């Protein structure tokens with residue numbers, strides 16, 4: 001995350017971190033339930049083997065609430081396109097269930113019609129992860145959060161040099177130097193409604209990070225709610 | 235109606251035959267008022283563990 005604030009105790013408890021063979025966080029995820037993590041399909045090509053760490057806020061300390069989980073099954077969308085990052089969504093079933101506690105809790109899955117009409121017409125959502133704090137920088141050792149304005153489809157399509165599909169939306173600032181960045185991919189985009197946080201996006205991609213006239217690009221979770229629901233029963 | 239302050243619903247608002255219907259995510263139960271969403275467990279989804 002470029003700019004924004006540290007996640008304080010209990011603020012981003014749905015944050016999951018995908019860790020590689022050598023125990024390096026490469027992608028984020030969102031805790032949906034005790035068995036299921038939401039992430040980006042493109043994250044599956046970042047490592048040959050990986051596990052999921054939950055309740056981690058500092059990757060250079062043992063705060064004591066951290067736990068690592070083996071992935072039983074990977075459910076990748078069959079229409080994922082590496083060329084465009086279209087259908088950039090995967091669901092992970094864990095071998096062992098997560099135990100909810102301090103800094104370990106699931107984000108709510110919204111209903112599509114309400115999410116699109118009510119959540120994604122709010123001013124801002126919140127993105128989080130251990131991604132880079134500068135475009136050509138190193139990944140954060142602290143979990144960070146950033147409030148990101150929703151961007152209308154039209155302005156976003158105008159902004160992009162790459163294809164913006166119907167499975168994507170855009171969030172962040174035009175000029176202001178705050179954005180998601182490399183390593184944040186697969187992590188949560190959530191929208192607060194009356195003090196409850198609903199998953200509204202997956203960190204997918206961007207033309208570097210925090211660039212003028214450029215936005216963060218998020219998988220439109222609302223379009224995959226039935227797909228997520230179907231994945232979570234197998 | 236769901237446009238008017240989410241029809242007074244805590245969470246999901248749906249307009250069915252001219253009237254508001256409220257519902258709640260998994261781990262929540264709709265209260266007697268048919269609007270508020272009550273957690274069923276200590277770690278309901280979408281709540282900061284503050």
Ligand SMILES: CCc1c(N2CC[C@H](O)C2=O)cccc1S(=O)(=O)N[C@@H](CNC(=O)c1ccc(Cl)s1)C(=O)OCCc1nccn1C
Pocket residue numbers: 026027042046082083084085162179180181182183184185203204205206207208209210215216217218
């Ligand atoms: C041109 C965009 C792009 C593509 N894509 C996407 C489809 C299109 O066809 C194309 O070319 C592919 C690779 C690199 C880049 S990039 O170098 O311009 N930007 C990086 C860094 N920025 C961000 O991660 C974000 C900024 C805001 C939000 Cl929101 S994510 C990125 O998107 O890495 C994603 C891959 C990844 N995830 C974890 C590790 N890694 C390496």
Ligand SMILES: [Ca+2]
Pocket residue numbers: 056057058059060061062063066
């Ligand atoms: Ca730690």
